[PDB]
Design an enzyme around this catalytic site. Structure first.
Site, mmCIF file in Angstrom:
data_model
loop_
_atom_site.group_PDB
_atom_site.id
_atom_site.type_symbol
_atom_site.label_atom_id
_atom_site.label_comp_id
_atom_site.label_asym_id
_atom_site.label_seq_id
_atom_site.Cartn_x
_atom_site.Cartn_y
_atom_site.Cartn_z
ATOM 1 N N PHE A 176 0.702 -24.273 2.181
ATOM 2 C CA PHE A 176 1.581 -23.169 1.840
ATOM 3 C C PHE A 176 0.856 -22.160 0.966
ATOM 4 O O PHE A 176 0.332 -22.500 -0.096
ATOM 5 C CB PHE A 176 2.843 -23.675 1.141
ATOM 6 C CG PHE A 176 3.866 -24.241 2.081
ATOM 7 C CD1 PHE A 176 4.928 -23.465 2.517
ATOM 8 C CD2 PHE A 176 3.761 -25.542 2.541
ATOM 9 C CE1 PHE A 176 5.869 -23.979 3.388
ATOM 10 C CE2 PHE A 176 4.700 -26.062 3.412
ATOM 11 C CZ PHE A 176 5.756 -25.279 3.836
ATOM 12 N N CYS A 225 8.217 -9.737 -4.332
ATOM 13 C CA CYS A 225 9.139 -9.556 -3.218
ATOM 14 C C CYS A 225 9.752 -8.162 -3.273
ATOM 15 O O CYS A 225 9.821 -7.552 -4.339
ATOM 16 C CB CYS A 225 10.236 -10.621 -3.243
ATOM 17 S SG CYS A 225 11.477 -10.433 -1.944
ATOM 18 N N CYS A 241 18.713 -9.339 -2.744
ATOM 19 C CA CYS A 241 18.781 -10.775 -2.486
ATOM 20 C C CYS A 241 18.955 -11.512 -3.813
ATOM 21 O O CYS A 241 18.098 -11.425 -4.693
ATOM 22 C CB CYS A 241 17.525 -11.254 -1.753
ATOM 23 S SG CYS A 241 17.442 -13.041 -1.447
ATOM 24 N N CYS A 280 17.846 -16.440 -4.492
ATOM 25 C CA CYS A 280 16.510 -17.025 -4.447
ATOM 26 C C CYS A 280 16.345 -18.120 -5.501
ATOM 27 O O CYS A 280 16.836 -17.991 -6.622
ATOM 28 C CB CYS A 280 15.450 -15.940 -4.642
ATOM 29 S SG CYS A 280 13.763 -16.463 -4.280
ATOM 30 N N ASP A 281 15.665 -19.201 -5.131
ATOM 31 C CA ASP A 281 15.424 -20.306 -6.053
ATOM 32 C C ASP A 281 13.928 -20.534 -6.235
ATOM 33 O O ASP A 281 13.499 -21.587 -6.706
ATOM 34 C CB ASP A 281 16.103 -21.586 -5.554
ATOM 35 C CG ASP A 281 15.524 -22.089 -4.244
ATOM 36 O OD1 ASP A 281 14.904 -21.292 -3.508
ATOM 37 O OD2 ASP A 281 15.694 -23.290 -3.945
ATOM 38 N N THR A 282 13.143 -19.528 -5.863
ATOM 39 C CA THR A 282 11.689 -19.627 -5.883
ATOM 40 C C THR A 282 11.073 -18.702 -6.932
ATOM 41 O O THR A 282 11.510 -17.565 -7.104
ATOM 42 C CB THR A 282 11.096 -19.288 -4.498
ATOM 43 O OG1 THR A 282 11.633 -20.182 -3.514
ATOM 44 C CG2 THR A 282 9.581 -19.407 -4.510
ATOM 45 N N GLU A 293 7.098 -17.017 6.766
ATOM 46 C CA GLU A 293 8.483 -16.990 6.323
ATOM 47 C C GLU A 293 8.777 -15.608 5.751
ATOM 48 O O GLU A 293 8.303 -15.273 4.666
ATOM 49 C CB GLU A 293 8.744 -18.073 5.272
ATOM 50 C CG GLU A 293 8.353 -19.480 5.701
ATOM 51 C CD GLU A 293 9.442 -20.175 6.494
ATOM 52 O OE1 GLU A 293 9.139 -21.181 7.172
ATOM 53 O OE2 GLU A 293 10.605 -19.721 6.431
ATOM 54 N N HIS A 323 12.460 -31.418 1.484
ATOM 55 C CA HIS A 323 11.511 -31.605 0.390
ATOM 56 C C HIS A 323 12.214 -31.708 -0.961
ATOM 57 O O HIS A 323 11.669 -32.268 -1.912
ATOM 58 C CB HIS A 323 10.485 -30.467 0.368
ATOM 59 C CG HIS A 323 11.091 -29.102 0.256
ATOM 60 N ND1 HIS A 323 11.834 -28.532 1.268
ATOM 61 C CD2 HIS A 323 11.049 -28.187 -0.741
ATOM 62 C CE1 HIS A 323 12.230 -27.329 0.895
ATOM 63 N NE2 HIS A 323 11.768 -27.095 -0.320
HETATM 64 C C1 LIG Z 1 11.732 -18.042 -0.925
HETATM 65 S S1 LIG Z 1 11.861 -17.398 0.690
HETATM 66 C C2 LIG Z 1 10.289 -16.592 0.840
HETATM 67 C C3 LIG Z 1 10.179 -15.807 2.168
HETATM 68 C C4 LIG Z 1 11.037 -14.514 2.203
HETATM 69 N N1 LIG Z 1 11.176 -13.905 0.864
HETATM 70 C C5 LIG Z 1 12.399 -14.899 2.887
HETATM 71 O O1 LIG Z 1 13.450 -14.611 2.272
HETATM 72 O O2 LIG Z 1 12.337 -15.468 4.000
HETATM 73 C C6 LIG Z 1 11.584 -18.878 1.668
HETATM 74 C C7 LIG Z 1 12.819 -19.409 2.444
HETATM 75 O O3 LIG Z 1 13.738 -20.088 1.555
HETATM 76 C C8 LIG Z 1 15.043 -19.583 1.758
HETATM 77 N N2 LIG Z 1 15.788 -19.683 0.508
HETATM 78 C C9 LIG Z 1 15.633 -18.909 -0.612
HETATM 79 N N3 LIG Z 1 16.462 -19.203 -1.583
HETATM 80 C C10 LIG Z 1 17.217 -20.247 -1.067
HETATM 81 C C11 LIG Z 1 18.277 -21.005 -1.600
HETATM 82 N N4 LIG Z 1 18.784 -20.817 -2.821
HETATM 83 N N5 LIG Z 1 18.811 -21.973 -0.820
HETATM 84 C C12 LIG Z 1 18.310 -22.161 0.403
HETATM 85 N N6 LIG Z 1 17.316 -21.509 1.012
HETATM 86 C C13 LIG Z 1 16.809 -20.556 0.219
HETATM 87 C C14 LIG Z 1 14.850 -18.154 2.252
HETATM 88 O O4 LIG Z 1 15.995 -17.693 2.957
HETATM 89 C C15 LIG Z 1 13.634 -18.330 3.164
HETATM 90 O O5 LIG Z 1 14.022 -18.782 4.455
HETATM 91 N N1 LIG Z 2 7.717 -28.924 1.353
HETATM 92 C C1 LIG Z 2 8.051 -27.648 1.141
HETATM 93 N N2 LIG Z 2 8.417 -26.921 2.225
HETATM 94 C C2 LIG Z 2 8.692 -25.581 1.980
HETATM 95 N N3 LIG Z 2 9.012 -24.813 3.032
HETATM 96 C C3 LIG Z 2 9.192 -23.506 2.806
HETATM 97 C C4 LIG Z 2 9.054 -22.954 1.535
HETATM 98 C C5 LIG Z 2 9.110 -21.469 1.324
HETATM 99 O O1 LIG Z 2 8.856 -20.671 2.252
HETATM 100 O O2 LIG Z 2 9.388 -21.121 0.152
HETATM 101 N N4 LIG Z 2 8.779 -23.698 0.454
HETATM 102 C C6 LIG Z 2 8.593 -25.011 0.663
HETATM 103 C C7 LIG Z 2 8.218 -25.876 -0.482
HETATM 104 O O3 LIG Z 2 8.145 -25.510 -1.654
HETATM 105 N N5 LIG Z 2 7.956 -27.186 -0.143
HETATM 106 S S1 SF4 Z 3 14.723 -15.526 -0.934
HETATM 107 FE FE1 SF4 Z 3 13.354 -14.915 -2.653
HETATM 108 S S2 SF4 Z 3 11.423 -14.275 -1.624
HETATM 109 FE FE2 SF4 Z 3 13.020 -14.334 0.006
HETATM 110 S S3 SF4 Z 3 13.819 -12.194 0.078
HETATM 111 FE FE3 SF4 Z 3 15.179 -13.327 -1.357
HETATM 112 S S4 SF4 Z 3 14.251 -12.957 -3.409
HETATM 113 FE FE4 SF4 Z 3 12.665 -12.378 -1.881
#
Ligand SMILES: C[S@@+](CC[C@H](N)C(=O)[O-])C[C@H]1O[C@@H](n2cnc3c(N)ncnc32)[C@H](O)[C@@H]1O
Ligand SMILES: Nc1nc2ncc(C(=O)O)nc2c(=O)[nH]1
Ligand code: SF4
Ligand SMILES: C[S@@+](CC[C@H](N)C(=O)[O-])C[C@H]1O[C@@H](n2cnc3c(N)ncnc32)[C@H](O)[C@@H]1O
Ligand SMILES: Nc1nc2ncc(C(=O)O)nc2c(=O)[nH]1
Ligand code: SF4
Lengths: 209, 209
Positions: A24, A30, A45, A48-50, A115, A203
């Site tokens: 990854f 973003c 958006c 987001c949890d990232t 992604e 995961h």
């Molecule tokens: C962190 S995003 C990064 C890629 C891009 N910013 C997007 O939105 O696809 C990675 C994936 O995790 C999903 N995701 C983000 N926050 C989430 C949440 N709280 N619960 C479940 N899926 C989530 C997004 O929809 C995306 O499919």
């Molecule tokens: N195993 C794993 N799969 C994942 N698959 C997708 C995404 C992402 O796009 O954010 N992140 C993970 C992650 O953190 N761990």
């Molecule tokens: S889920 Fe996170 S990385 Fe993906 S569009 Fe939303 S804020 Fe950006």
């Protein structure tokens, strides 16, 4: 030059390729959210949890060119093993992901997945295109390999998504204080509309990177 | 005549098609284990966690012909919805699943997958053939779509399995008193040998049928 938050090798946790070994590459930044918690409440958006802010994660940094980034990615792969596969995420990877990087990855024997939130035009040469539409954002990518929609979102036209040109149509439970609640919803949705499949964030259950 | 343990409609919990909506047709009886607890300790396959004894399950019973069985299977599918898919399992489905039942399902617009231990020859007309080889049983099905191996088993030759003619190669943690342990093993195996992907029994985490 590329601003990468973190690079790690693990199994894909979610999506149509869940369980598959991959590197990854999480790009920093973003276009739909700054990443600051004070901005989340009014972001495009908001669920987001990232963490995609900065370049301080594992193997993270500011790479000068593609080859420097590819070297780090390829270095994480088990030596002497094939099936090299990289997932470009973030953040929004299409902010930084260009053709020179794609060519360099393919040159290294890597299959490339992405992604993306779908608000930015993607590169056709990417092997696997995963689009995750954000309801309050424009969707300019209306074709790809898999459509992974996170539910529930307000203003969402879920059934309309099925009319798009993708091979796989998945719903993914929104993680948070209502994960179990949203999971029941996603399962209920797929059973009522069997075109859709469930995308579980495995995961988070297996407690792996 | 067909003896079926249970027929239920849910999402596929494991394998390459996890999350996909499907009707599960669980045939009664197996050829590697009688299903009796008294016979487990001396059986060829000793780690089974499935009830396949009798026809007393949900929608279970003796079906005189294919049409009767197909009618029940089709009856579980959401009205007006397509993407009809059935997973034939058990038990060992190749002890009962014949060509007329396949043609009847295909005529009913059903896609057919099979979960088989690989000790019996399978019908080529089946759309998705998933083989789960048991270590102390003969393996006569050396080709198919999905090779889902349950680990760890004693006498297992895991690497040799990867030489077989399959599209997907999966390892699935043996559930039991050491499931968490086996999961770590499976994850480690895929990372060390990226030809293999992880098959997680998601339905045991999501608590769905
Ligand atoms: C962190 S995003 C990064 C890629 C891009 N910013 C997007 O939105 O696809 C990675 C994936 O995790 C999903 N995701 C983000 N926050 C989430 C949440 N709280 N619960 C479940 N899926 C989530 C997004 O929809 C995306 O499919
Ligand atoms: N195993 C794993 N799969 C994942 N698959 C997708 C995404 C992402 O796009 O954010 N992140 C993970 C992650 O953190 N761990
Ligand atoms: S889920 Fe996170 S990385 Fe993906 S569009 Fe939303 S804020 Fe950006
Ligand atoms: C119950 S079997 C029925 C199909 C056929 N009898 C076979 O062995 O493939 C269905 C699937 O569950 C797997 N399985 C059975 N017992 C298991 C256990 N304790 N832990 C994990 N998987 C198991 C089998 O290996 C097989 O892939
Ligand atoms: N959801 C779900 N998926 C399943 N997938 C496969 C098998 C099987 O072949 O035994 N069994 C189940 C099951 O009981 N539930
Ligand atoms: S071969 Fe399959 S159905 Fe038979 S006992 Fe083993 S796991 Fe259960």
């Amino acid at each position: 030059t590329y601003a990468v938050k973190e690079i790690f090798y693990t199994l894909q946790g979610e999506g149509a390729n869940a369980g598959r070994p991959a590197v990854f590459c999480r790009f920093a930044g973003c276009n739909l959210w700054s990443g600051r918690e004070e901005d989340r409440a009014q972001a495009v958006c908001r669920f987001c949890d990232t963490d995609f802010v900065g370049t301080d994660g594992e193997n993270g940094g500011k790479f000068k060119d593609a080859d420097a980034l590819v070297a780090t990615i390829a270095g994480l792969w088990p030596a002497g093993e094939a099936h090299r596969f990289v997932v470009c995420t973030g953040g929004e990877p299409m902010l930084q992901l260009d053709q020179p990087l794609v060519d360099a990855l393919h040159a290294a024997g890597f299959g490339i997945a992405i992604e993306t939130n779908g608000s930015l035009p993607v590169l056709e040469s990417i092997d696997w295109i995963c689009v995750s539409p954000k309801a309050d954002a424009p969707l300019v990518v209306t074709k790809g390999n898999e459509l992974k929609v996170v539910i529930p979102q307000d203003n969402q036209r879920l059934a309309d998504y099925a009319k798009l040109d993708f091979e796989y149509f998945l719903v993914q439970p929104m993680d948070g204080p209502s994960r179990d609640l949203n999971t029941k919803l996603a399962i209920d949705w797929c059973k009522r509309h069997p075109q859709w499949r469930l995308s579980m964030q495995t995961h988070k259950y297996l407690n792996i990177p």
